Ligand binder design. Sequence first.
Ligand code: FMN
Ligand code: FMN
Ligand code: FMN
Ligand code: FMN
Ligand code: FMN
Ligand code: FMN
Ligand code: FMN
Ligand code: FMN
Ligand code: FMN
Lengths: 189, 189, 189, 189, 189, 189, 189, 189, 189
Amino acid sequence: ENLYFQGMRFVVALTGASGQILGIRLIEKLTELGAEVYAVASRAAKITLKAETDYDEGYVREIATKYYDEDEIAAPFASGSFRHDGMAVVPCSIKTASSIAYGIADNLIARAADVTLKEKRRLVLAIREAPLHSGHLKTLARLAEMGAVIFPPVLSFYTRPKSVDDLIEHTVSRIAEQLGVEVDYRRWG
Amino acid sequence: ENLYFQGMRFVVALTGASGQILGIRLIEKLTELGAEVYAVASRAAKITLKAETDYDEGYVREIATKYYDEDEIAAPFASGSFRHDGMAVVPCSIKTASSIAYGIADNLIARAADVTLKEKRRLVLAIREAPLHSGHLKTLARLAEMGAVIFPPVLSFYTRPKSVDDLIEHTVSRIAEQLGVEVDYRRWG
Amino acid sequence: ENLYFQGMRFVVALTGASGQILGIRLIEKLTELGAEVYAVASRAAKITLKAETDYDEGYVREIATKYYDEDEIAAPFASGSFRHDGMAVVPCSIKTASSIAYGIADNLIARAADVTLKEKRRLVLAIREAPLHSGHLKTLARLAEMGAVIFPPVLSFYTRPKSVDDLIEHTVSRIAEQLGVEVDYRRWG
Amino acid sequence: ENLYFQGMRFVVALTGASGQILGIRLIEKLTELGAEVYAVASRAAKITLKAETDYDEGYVREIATKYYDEDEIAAPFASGSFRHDGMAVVPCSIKTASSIAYGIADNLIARAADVTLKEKRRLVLAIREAPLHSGHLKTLARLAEMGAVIFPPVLSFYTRPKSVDDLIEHTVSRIAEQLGVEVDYRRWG
Amino acid sequence: ENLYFQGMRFVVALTGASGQILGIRLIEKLTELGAEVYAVASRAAKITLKAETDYDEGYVREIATKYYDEDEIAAPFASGSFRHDGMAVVPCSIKTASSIAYGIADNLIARAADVTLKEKRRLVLAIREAPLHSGHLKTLARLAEMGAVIFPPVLSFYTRPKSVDDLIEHTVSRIAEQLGVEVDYRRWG
Amino acid sequence: ENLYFQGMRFVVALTGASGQILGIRLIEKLTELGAEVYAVASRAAKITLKAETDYDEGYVREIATKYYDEDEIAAPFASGSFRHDGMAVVPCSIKTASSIAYGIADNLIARAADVTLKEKRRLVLAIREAPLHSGHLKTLARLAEMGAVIFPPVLSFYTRPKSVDDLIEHTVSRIAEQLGVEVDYRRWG
Amino acid sequence: ENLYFQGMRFVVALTGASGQILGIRLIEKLTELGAEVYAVASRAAKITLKAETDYDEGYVREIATKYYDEDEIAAPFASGSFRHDGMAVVPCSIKTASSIAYGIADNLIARAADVTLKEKRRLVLAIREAPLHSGHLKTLARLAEMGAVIFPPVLSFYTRPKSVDDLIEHTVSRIAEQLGVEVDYRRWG
Amino acid sequence: ENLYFQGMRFVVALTGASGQILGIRLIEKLTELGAEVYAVASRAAKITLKAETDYDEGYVREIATKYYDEDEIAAPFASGSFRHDGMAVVPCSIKTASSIAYGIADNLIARAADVTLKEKRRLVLAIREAPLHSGHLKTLARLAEMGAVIFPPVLSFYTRPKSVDDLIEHTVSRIAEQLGVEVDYRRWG
Amino acid sequence: ENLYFQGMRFVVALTGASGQILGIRLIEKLTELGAEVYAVASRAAKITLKAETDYDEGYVREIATKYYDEDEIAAPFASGSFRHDGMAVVPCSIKTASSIAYGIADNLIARAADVTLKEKRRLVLAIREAPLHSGHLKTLARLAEMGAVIFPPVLSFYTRPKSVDDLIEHTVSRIAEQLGVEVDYRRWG
Ligand SMILES: Cc1cc2nc3c(=O)[nH]c(=O)nc-3n(C[C@H](O)[C@H](O)[C@H](O)COP(=O)(O)O)c2cc1C
Ligand SMILES: Cc1cc2nc3c(=O)[nH]c(=O)nc-3n(C[C@H](O)[C@H](O)[C@H](O)COP(=O)(O)O)c2cc1C
Ligand SMILES: Cc1cc2nc3c(=O)[nH]c(=O)nc-3n(C[C@H](O)[C@H](O)[C@H](O)COP(=O)(O)O)c2cc1C
Ligand SMILES: Cc1cc2nc3c(=O)[nH]c(=O)nc-3n(C[C@H](O)[C@H](O)[C@H](O)COP(=O)(O)O)c2cc1C
Ligand SMILES: Cc1cc2nc3c(=O)[nH]c(=O)nc-3n(C[C@H](O)[C@H](O)[C@H](O)COP(=O)(O)O)c2cc1C
Ligand SMILES: Cc1cc2nc3c(=O)[nH]c(=O)nc-3n(C[C@H](O)[C@H](O)[C@H](O)COP(=O)(O)O)c2cc1C
Ligand SMILES: Cc1cc2nc3c(=O)[nH]c(=O)nc-3n(C[C@H](O)[C@H](O)[C@H](O)COP(=O)(O)O)c2cc1C
Ligand SMILES: Cc1cc2nc3c(=O)[nH]c(=O)nc-3n(C[C@H](O)[C@H](O)[C@H](O)COP(=O)(O)O)c2cc1C
Ligand SMILES: Cc1cc2nc3c(=O)[nH]c(=O)nc-3n(C[C@H](O)[C@H](O)[C@H](O)COP(=O)(O)O)c2cc1C
């Protein structure tokens, strides 16, 4: 659609929080619109996928432009000299959000996110946990100060959703807008 | 069920964030289990109810034990000497979360929440906004330091939800647990 | 007495905290001593007056030099170019203290207090709440840093009070001293 | 009444702030309701008692379950291994509040309060001073962060008090509620 | 004894700090008193056990109600919806204390502790290191702000210990009291 | 041994925390190795010595090179112009740690420690308390920022201790190493 | 001279820092100019006077308008209701500066200074210590935020001093100017 | 040269940042001068060595006095009781710098560095990343507060370098000076 | 005396604060004891020398080992690779203290001091100003955190000084001790 003309490419990482379908649908949306997606899924994300979905273990690799596991710490986007247009961690665990906040860049996901931030590229973190305690909130404040977009994947009813897929589509569209993507979807305005 | 034997009573306030159904279902759940619910809905919550639901304007007053509008600043739970077992603001707007954080206690909802906090009673805030920027996060950190439970009403898939109502039931059950209620529902453990 | 020779004039505002009699008696004291008092009472202060006293709704307007309601946001002392010798908010609610602290200057009382502070004139806040939680205390610290006098209207027994009016007289005299007024009363020294 | 069935026991300490009668009446109230009270009065509290009351120097020892002077630094509740249900310092001087805040635990009162806090037992401080300056407020914020209840013994008029004893009864009842005591008294609700 | 009547269950985790015997004895104590103990031992804790004790590698699994290794990140208490009465990390390394403080929830121990904290359940950390430098102290302050009990397992002589086992019994009893357990042992009061 | 050749001299102070034997054994160790020890014991330390040991009240004075009581505020090491090689407070109460942190230098122990710090000499504080709450931790952070060594006297099992004296020897040796003393003892390396 | 016409009265306290002559000369200067001086000397100040001067122990009492010892905690200026024009602590120890900063108001000097500050009267602290470490500096910053004048009694040579008394006269004159006194002395302008 | 006479021994760790040659040359320099070097290389450092050099995988083990892999968490210098003269992490990744800062001491390198810091031994971190964002800078500030030397391995031209090896020699010499080594090299003075 | 055997060399800088004689006497003392002194005097220090002394404009250059003016920004000790044993700024103006604190290293004095600090060499700042306001105190706190010794050149009377030169000798001796110099002088101990 409107992402191949400028030839966009995004990093999308899935981590071990509930909501694997959100990252899968975001990858599907971005590639449909003509962007390249470099995808990574952590070991805990693969465990969560099995726990809460019926997706095949290879589906993310199949729909991505290029696929990396989390120990591929020499992947191209582990260096700031590799150009890309934004990274999303969807869904984002506390563990990965915190690893990014504090620089515990011990796998490809945290390192790629740190590289995204240091180069002042867009980073969107769909951080799923509730409640959030004071330590979580201090971590999210630090991430916001570092430039990350903090996007709790909250329930939203103002678009009159009728199915689970309706909720997923709204949240995925909203996350895509944080990457600079001008997605078409049902807005309040 | 297990809330009339100790004769629990809770304050539940609805504010002008998306997710009116979450507060309505929480009231329905708490009263079914035998607790008294003193309910309040802000003017913006009434506007949101009309925008995103088909509920009658009088439904919350009908299902509550006692109902107050937001300008009833002399309601019983506006004083710390009135005993109750916890307050939930569901859904909670940034405006009401921030008013509580900083003491702008200019209506019954913010005052009742401030009274809840100063008496070290339980306060649960189902704060719905995304993204959250650094000012939001500093406000939520302040609320957490004041003792509030910060509960973004996030999408949750580990209970294999099949309908919108499934998601609402999970989130409402989880919020109820933050009030000390031992609700029966589908848990990960 | 000793306030007309220099022709003092003070702003006294009553807000919706318990202790309306403290502000009424402060106005009575300041005018007896020959100062002009520009008075304002909030809507919640009028409600509290009815709840806890037998005072007529017009008494404050009757005893003041000039009277304003809280929506008179163009009153003379809403601008820093109007000269006066100090403002007291007695009693002061958390809502009004916090509105001043954080600049939510949405009525005449909060704006007049902000104007008092920015011009480095004396502002005394008789803040009545107990307990005070950590958010309250951070707000009061901010007000103190901005230059306000923080005067919780505490019980005081060292003057051997024999009636409620004895306690009111001590506290009102002490608040008056924070305005620079050399009131005559029973001191420890 | 409702404190012997669970066999409650509280520590009540009186310090050298005005309002000795508040601590005396709190001890009287707690023992009437069937709790044990372990009482301590500082040397400055004994001086204040003589200055502002006609109480005998031995009255607190007479009404307490067990009495300690402030240099009894080996009293049972100086160790966290001694069980009790809460401590109140009523009235609480700036000196004792600050000693607790900063760990200057140089007498039984400050040590017992520090032990109360480190064991996450309830501590209520009826801190009497006005004005409070920025150093006081930073100290009270620290105490609140450590878990203490900060209860300035403010004038309260919403129960229509007709005598000094009416004010004392309200404030003492409210302080008792901060210890978890379900006292019977005239409430706003 | 007094923990089966309410059917208590606790999480006890052992990490790679010196003092493995403290966690083993805590498990033994809690189960003797009739509580269920869900135990976890990290890989470094197993190494320390071999270095400083003669315990069999399977003893903790034998005495626990249910046993998990640290990579069992889908254990029941990894979700806040699983009910339990408190978690203790005994002994607690700097690595695990810090992982909890900052949200590096990369194994079952840190995740279970984070879940304990976000649900405002009791968490006791028997943090063993000396000296503690300024970074350690900032971490422990953050944990305390998040609600954890910070229990350095210090030498204690006021119970006149005559053997190493006497010291272990005192410290284990004191840690148990931080879980709300009313253990019987030799107290100063 | 290796402390008389450079003619070392240390200040060792005992305060009213449990673990008097730790300070006694540290004095014995330092003098055996040929250093001079200027010792001080607070009044609360003398009370603790009687409570938890069978030591004579004069033993510390007997084993020290020179002995001072805590009110000897003009002792030589109360001035920075007196040269010495380090001070240890063993055991160190919260009261004395906090007095040093905040400058409440009201006896010889706190003043000597403040003089040690301002001259950038070594100060080691064997701070014994558990739990430590957030106020304690903020105090210890301040002390660490001022340059003090923070040494909670924790249980240590990696040297396979078989008696209480084994634990004391390890902890005393470790504290001695913080003074720059190259003590001979059983190390992990 | 120019202090009796408005009938000034000051509190001057001497504490146990070197420079007793500075406080003695300040008292002499203020009374010569016609002000009343209420003087207090701590026990450590009396010890320092004997150590570094030949002054009689009764001289300060002789030259003061009224004299108090430090345990006269009921002196008139221990209450904010007693009027005076400023307090100076000259010389000021770290112990007394810190006691004021943190509210350890355990003698007349610290309490009178706290009362001076809470009433927004002038307080000048001639704080003598060198070096000042980071804890000292944080304390002095807190005092400055509370409104105190921080006056290290530094050597000054721009008035070409020829004797010790010349230095004392300059420093005492400069301290007097911080009390609002328009002393006549040799200025740079 | 001048490091065997006092028999120095250093820990040198290589982590997965660019600049493996800097750590290799530092080891070569320290051993040439007669010090013992205990070396450790992380898994990511071994990957970087292969990516950017032609060094054999066994070279670091060959030139070191003793060699450890990063999972040897029981190596001698993992305990503070093992004596050494300083540790350098050269080059130092953000991941390892941050792990040290925040106490995520999950391998030998981070633990050895934490042990170095808690014993107030010298730690030099040759932290290589650019840009550094605000989270990195807050981490480096924390490390500096903990006592670490923060040494970005910057280009330096004032010694007129003519080859890459000239730059390496300057930077390695400068890092060696931070360990207290008096290396001979071309200085500006 | 005891500074040539190890061949000490110090940087001594004079800035435009009163007390030029303190720096002159420090240079004289250090060279008498056999150290080399590299001296620098700012333009404002030369102006102050003329204003308050009769010293020739060339005296500092005459007594120094090597002399530099403040614009000699390429002097040897402007680089960290030049070895020296400590720097003193005596007397130190607010301008130069603040320039060092905040890195405004725009002349040789501020740069040499910054180089001293970054190499963790000793820096002593004889900061002369009174009063010190909150901005000064925040600056001095920052300098202390950076490792500088903060030495206000305060009047000291405990050595019974009889002349101005007696005071200078005490203060200069004390400053010399902060450089690690074991000067012989009249001490309290
Ligand atoms: C079924 C399941 C669901 C989980 N959901 C969350 C979650 O929603 N949020 C979270 O912070 N952690 C969650 N966790 C725990 C994380 O998976 C765990 O912290 C893991 O170490 C994260 O690692 P990663 O960020 O590298 O994928 C979940 C674990 C499981 C087994
Ligand atoms: C349809 C609709 C949906 C809204 N949803 C949110 C929301 O989800 N979160 C939020 O902070 N504000 C939301 N707002 C804006 C708030 O209603 C607005 O800030 C209002 O002043 C809140 O007032 P209240 O907290 O007193 O109800 C919404 C407004 C409308 C009209
Ligand atoms: C009878 C009554 C007494 C009240 N007392 C207090 C009080 O003492 N302190 C307080 O913060 N709020 C008190 N409130 C709540 C305030 O009136 C409420 O926050 C209001 O919005 C304050 O608005 P105002 O500051 O503009 O007058 C009271 C309310 C009522 C009805
Ligand atoms: C008559 C009298 C009343 C006092 N009232 C107060 C007070 O209300 N608040 C306060 O902080 N100090 C007050 N003080 C001063 C304290 O008694 C003084 O700070 C004392 O050291 C407190 O010690 P304590 O806390 O150990 O009892 C009063 C003193 C006197 C003589
Ligand atoms: C014998 C031995 C004893 C140890 N003792 C401690 C200790 O007391 N405190 C600490 O923080 N680390 C200690 N460590 C290091 C930790 O085991 C190391 O940081 C490890 O990564 C902790 O991981 P864990 O918390 O997941 O068990 C010790 C290591 C060994 C081999
Ligand atoms: C038997 C006994 C043991 C004590 N143990 C401790 C302790 O371990 N830690 C502590 O902070 N205070 C302890 N205290 C309380 C202190 O002794 C008390 O705070 C005292 O004022 C400390 O004063 P000092 O530091 O001047 O010796 C103990 C008191 C007693 C009677
Ligand atoms: C001769 C002598 C001189 C002293 N000089 C100082 C000093 O200059 N600054 C300081 O902080 N303490 C000094 N002290 C220590 C204080 O006197 C000690 O901290 C005392 O407790 C202060 O108590 P005060 O403030 O109540 O007088 C000195 C002590 C002595 C014996
Ligand atoms: C070729 C290569 C070069 C790297 N360079 C750096 C670097 O210069 N700085 C950095 O922080 N991370 C760098 N990384 C990423 C780290 O290796 C990664 O964060 C790793 O987890 C660090 O682990 P370690 O500190 O345990 O060695 C690099 C990775 C690769 C593959
Ligand atoms: C006679 C005289 C004395 C001065 N004394 C001081 C002083 O004691 N403290 C201070 O901060 N500034 C003092 N100043 C002002 C400084 O000289 C001025 O801030 C100057 O810019 C400092 O520059 P420098 O640090 O590079 O020498 C004095 C100025 C003059 C003319």
